[PDB]
């Protein structure tokens, strides 16, 4: 079926550059108008750049916000769409999507990718501290968690027991604190099974190439 996959997203400083690409498949690439649309955090989708089809000779249109800095192009033999992004600004930080038109109406978006995340910031790539959340000094069900704090840039993934009680996990979105991200994750399991059996949160942060595994322990001595 039709598929669009974005890549090339990452962290850059203000004034740097990035190149995005969009691997398209499942249609005759050259027959369609292709676009870049972004969603900055908490804001409306913002159309940026359009490149038309072969019939139209592949002409382009840009939003005033990226004009002269960003350039949309196509590799027609390979079915790849590009966004070259120069003179990056912190306000450029967003999820970037590539899209294709629906054929009837050329300025609509029948297919989108899932997006690629672009961060423009002066903060440095930093791995998370991972803290356990266990009950202190109970009933049939027990809630446990992991507090993941002080990381940059997003994202982190928290896995509980290699994916086995992911039916009752809650992932709380990250918020920026002191220039850095914090999130937490919780899992709820029967008391019959913890602390009787092991419960571990594994925290992957690909940006720093870090994985932390943290076993949740019961309330025990200060010693041991």
């Amino acid at each position: 079926e039709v598929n669009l996959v974005e890549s090339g997203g990452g962290l850059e400083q203000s004034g740097g550059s990035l190149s995005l690409s969009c691997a398209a498949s499942g249609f005759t690439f050259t027959d369609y108008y292709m676009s870049w649309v972004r969603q900055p955090p908490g804001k409306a989708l913002e159309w940026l750049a359009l490149i038309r089809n072969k019939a139209k000779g592949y002409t382009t249109e840009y939003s005033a916000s990226v004009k002269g800095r960003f350039t949309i192009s196509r590799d027609n033999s390979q079915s790849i769409l590009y966004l070259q992004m120069n003179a990056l600004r912190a306000e450029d930080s967003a999820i970037y999507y590539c899209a294709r038109d629906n054929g009837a109406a050329r300025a609509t978006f029948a297919y989108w990718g899932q997006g690629t995340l672009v961060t423009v910031s002066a903060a440095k790539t930093t791995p998370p501290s991972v803290y356990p959340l266990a009950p202190g000094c109970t009933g049939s069900s027990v809630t446990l968690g992991c507090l993941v704090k002080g990381y940059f840039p997003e994202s982190v993934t928290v896995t509980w027991n290699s994916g086995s009680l992911s039916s009752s996990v809650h992932t709380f979105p990250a918020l920026l604190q002191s220039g850095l991200y914090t999130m937490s994750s919780s899992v709820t399991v029967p008391s019959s099974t913890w602390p009787s059996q092991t419960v571990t949160c594994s925290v992957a942060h690909p940006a720093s190439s870090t994985t932390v595994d943290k076993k949740l322990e019961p309330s025990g001595p200060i010693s041991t």
Binding site: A104, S129, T143, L147, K149, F172, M183, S184
Partner: protein, 214 residues
């Protein structure tokens, strides 16, 4: 350039209900209004274009109307899968511009949160910090108040709250509330309480612990 105002920003509704969503352009867009839906872990899908033409595959319970500056999307007899974020977009003219969205939320029975409190870990105390964490899980609706009390005294600085999106399966929300202090600050007081007030009861659900009961 053409600015687009979507309303309402939020609407709760029941399976089987009919609802209407509005979009208003600052100047005429002729008939060229498109509607989309967004859901987490899915790519955006086009529902309607040129005001009232259904995208191939859209269910017929979707319909669009309007011209000029005022349009509406109507969905008859909502199906579970229809609960989503809906956007409008004008496609009359460049720069293409979108509304900010209408969150169409699935109305379920009211539910109180399960509340859990966590002291700071040893690990965090060793580093110089103290985060006290409260989880409030599986409630509905999303409106809730959490207050933090230290030695009975309301604490209104350093609290951060975060909510999940509505759950696909049980239609609930969950949130975390985290009070972050320095170690020194943490050690100068004894009792830490997070109190949740939610429309399911006039009594707050209260969870506490004493630093010096351990």
């Amino acid at each position: 350039d053409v600015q687009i105002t979507q309303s309402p920003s939020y609407l709760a509704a029941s399976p089987g209900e009919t609802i209407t969503i509005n979009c208003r352009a600052s100047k005429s867009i002729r008939k060229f209004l498109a509607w989309y839906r967004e859901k987490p872990g899915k790519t955006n899908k086009l529902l309607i274009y040129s005001g009232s033409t259904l995208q191939s595959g859209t269910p017929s319970r979707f319909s669009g109307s309007g011209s000029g500056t005022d349009f509406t999307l109507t969905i008859s007899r909502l199906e579970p899968e229809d609960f989503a974020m809906y956007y409008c977009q004008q496609h009359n003219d460049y720069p293409l511009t979108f509304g900010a969205g209408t969150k169409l939320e699935l109305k379920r029975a009211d539910a109180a949160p399960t509340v859990s409190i966590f002291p700071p870990s040893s690990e965090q105390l060793t580093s110089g910090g103290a985060s006290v964490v409260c989880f409030l899980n599986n409630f509905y609706p999303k409106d809730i108040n959490v207050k933090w009390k230290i030695d009975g005294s309301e604490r209104q600085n350093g609290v951060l709250n975060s909510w999940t999106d509505q759950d696909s399966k049980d239609s609930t929300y969950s949130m975390s509330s985290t009070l972050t202090l320095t170690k020194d600050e943490y050690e100068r007081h004894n009792s830490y309480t997070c109190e949740a007030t939610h429309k399911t009861s006039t009594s707050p659900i209260v969870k506490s612990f004493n630093r010096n009961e351990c």
